[PDB]
From a paper:
One E3 ligase with a critical role in many immune signalling pathways is TNF receptor-associated factor 6 (TRAF6). TRAF6 preferentially builds Lys63-linked ubiquitin chains by virtue of its interaction with the Ubc13-Uev1A (also called Ube2N-Ube2V1) E2 complex following engagement of receptors. To identify the essential features that regulate ubiquitin chain assembly by TRAF6 we have determined structures of the RING and ZF domains of TRAF6 bound to the Ubc13~Ub conjugate in two crystal forms at 3.4 and 3.9 Å. Both structures show that the Ubc13~Ub conjugate contacts both protomers of the TRAF6 dimer.
We therefore expressed and purified a truncated construct that contained the RING and just ZF1 of D. rerio TRAF6 (denoted DrRZ1). RZ1 and RZ3 had a comparable level of activity suggesting that the shorter construct contains the key determinants of activity. TRAF6 RZ1 formed a stable complex with Ubc13~Ub that allowed purification and crystallisation of the complex. The structure was solved at 3.4 Å and contains two 1:1 DrRZ1-Ubc13~Ub complexes in the asymmetric unit. Each DrRZ1-Ubc13~Ub conjugate complex sits on a twofold axis and as a result the crystal contains two distinct symmetrical complexes, which have a centrally positioned TRAF6 RING dimer associated with two Ubc13~Ub conjugates. The α-carbons of the two symmetrical RZ1 complexes overlay with an RMSD of 0.4 Å, and both are similar to the RZ3 complex, with an RMSD of 0.9 and 1.5 Å. The contacts between proteins are very similar in all TRAF6 complexes and provide a molecular basis for understanding TRAF6 function. In the TRAF6-Ubc13~Ub complex, there are close contacts between ubiquitin and two Arg residues in the linker-helix and ZF1 of the interacting protomer. The sidechain of Arg126 from the linker-helix sits at the RING dimer interface and contacts Gly87 of the interacting RING domain, as well as the main chain of Lys33 at the base of the α-helix in ubiquitin. Whereas, Arg147 from ZF1 packs against Asp32 of ubiquitin.
Author numbering:
A (entry chain A), D (entry chain A): 53 to 160
B (entry chain C), E (entry chain C): 1 to 76
C (entry chain B), F (entry chain B): 3 to 150
The structure:
């Protein structure tokens, strides 16, 4: 169910902070032994459905071998983003989005 | 010269090579950036699978020519 | 409401097209794709335009997309119904791979036919026994069925 | 004995790729559970000499809890650097430095 | 307004706050960037240890005023 | 050939100085530092300039630097020989910490004297029993020993 962070980044989201599976910002980032980043849910879905291997190069990858890239997470959460609601022009850090989305004046 | 290489995700990278470089040489440079071993890579240009033996000058890959990256292709 | 990978993956593919390959989604169903792969250079299919139909299943990207030719083609790895014997679709798939890469692999398959792992057995037999005949047959099949 | 990568980066080395212990490029980068980067040798020296804790915030840190930030390593090795020898003006990726330093025309 | 915060390593970061913000509020913003819990931080300005209770307007911290970060200070 | 952290850490500190605190290395020994901390605002030492001597040991940064005052100062956490009762130096050190941060903590210690964890016992006793007297004593000790 849970994918990555879906919002227009400003400047646009760099590929290094992008998930190969959902093509969005890395929600709860995790890094492999071979050494690339995925969301927590997405890579575990690729293991559970598609098989115990790293999507991009077919290297060996168990579910336990993953670890959280908390350095990457702190960087991503501080990136500036635009309000996802139609009409709103305001900007903020990604960490402050969920707070503002309740406070936003344009939501349905 | 420069050459564009479109990765699996859609993101592009740009390498620095000469026409004398082999396909094995270019796959080794793509390993350095992305962390994909050379045997696992399959490079496409003008709808033609580029094989390890030949060079970039043989296939006629020029300045700012866009390659494409594909995963390992074994059995059907 | 479609899965939001597909909505991005459509936009990236449509905004930055691949040289030779046209691709657009169906207006009534975003999971169906009107594909038209042009025939590659220095092959049996030099100067042809072949239709295809690509479908994204329910559990995409964890399941591979189903692709079939919508044009008659003399090729050992493609059967007479249009279904393709390509490795991305019949095993060893990963969600990292995209629609863009599948169409590139199908484009690459036309330049490099492999009778040793066949699907159309009459075509694969023809290719091994008399190769120059089968290439000229495929060149005629391009002119009959795949030029306009 | 072994510290980080000691060379003039161009543009200058960003703090995110810098080791807090040696103040240089992260040689064989490793990330903690609390989530910051060190060299392999330097953090293990801080554990062995100074104690089982993360230098920057005194969080709990065993020697086994570390893991290699191979994503960070590949980025650092592709950063452009200048020749460390006095007089040489040539530039290259960090990965190609050791090769060129034997080939360099200005070394003592 | 902006305020400069010099970290343990020597690197600087810039936060966005008003004078009404507490020192507990600023230490919570420094936690978000660097990953150091607020109780572990000790902020210095003009040679004065800034304590959790007061605000930035009390100590008189203005636009582009440089704070300094120090580790936990308990027993001598 | 010094350890190359110290050579960078000297350059950063010298190029970007701290307001109030002067610091330079000794010309014959890079491990010794001529420090001169200015007295902080709204304290007993308002408008003074105190010398210090900072030394970097052999296994720095894994061992903390040894610091001592080179000026007479009426302070409960500083003894009559000049050695300092500050927490960075007497325990719980980490190699992340630098010379810059040590001098900032010593600067901060002057504004906030703590008799409850003392070193000079006569000064710490004087501070608790008669605080306003001890502050005026320290103000005189600044004027005698620490103004030029
Ligand atoms: Zn994802
Ligand atoms: Zn991998
Ligand atoms: Zn809004
Ligand atoms: Zn280091
Ligand atoms: Zn930490
Ligand atoms: Zn050189």
């Amino acid at each position: 169910d849970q994918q990555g962070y879906d919002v227009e980044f400003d400047p646009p989201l760099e590929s290094k902070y992008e998930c190969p599976i959902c093509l969005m910002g890395l929600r709860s980032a995790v890094q492999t032994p071979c050494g690339h980043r995925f969301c927590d849910s997405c890579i575990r879905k690729s293991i559970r459905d598609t098989g115990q291997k790293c999507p991009v190069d077919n290297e060996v990858l168990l579910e336990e071998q993953l670890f959280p890239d908390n350095f990457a997470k702190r960087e991503i959460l501080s990136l500036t983003v635009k309000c996802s609601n139609f009409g709103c022009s305001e900007k903020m850090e990604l960490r402050q989005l969920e707070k503002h989305l309740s406070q936003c004046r344009f939501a349905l | 010269m420069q050459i564009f290489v479109k990765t699996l995700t859609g993101k592009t990278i740009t390498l620095e090579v000469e026409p004398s470089d082999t396909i094995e040489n270019v796959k080794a440079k793509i390993q350095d950036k992305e962390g994909i071993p050379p045997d696992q890579q399959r490079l496409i240009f003008a709808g033609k699978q580029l094989e390890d033996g030949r060079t970039l000058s043989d296939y006629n890959i020029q300045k700012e020519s866009t390659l494409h990256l594909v995963l390992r292709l074994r059995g059907g | 409401g479609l899965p939001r990978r597909i909505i991005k993956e459509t936009q990236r593919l449509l905004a930055e097209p691949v040289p030779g390959i046209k691709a657009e989604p169906d207006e009534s169903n975003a999971r169906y794709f009107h594909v038209v792969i042009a025939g590659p250079q220095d092959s049996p299919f030099e100067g042809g335009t072949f239709k295809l139909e690509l479908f994204l299943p329910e559990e995409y990207p964890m399941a591979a997309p189903k692709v079939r030719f919508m044009t008659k083609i003399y090729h050992p790895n493609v059967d007479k119904l249009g279904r393709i014997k390509l490795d991305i679709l019949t095993d060893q798939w990963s969600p990292a791979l995209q629609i863009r890469t599948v169409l590139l692999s199908i484009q690459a398959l036309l330049s490099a036919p492999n009778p040793d792992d066949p699907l159309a057995n009459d075509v694969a037999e023809q290719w091994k026994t008399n190769e120059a005949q089968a290439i000229e047959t495929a060149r005629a099949w391009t002119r009959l069925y795949a030029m306009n």
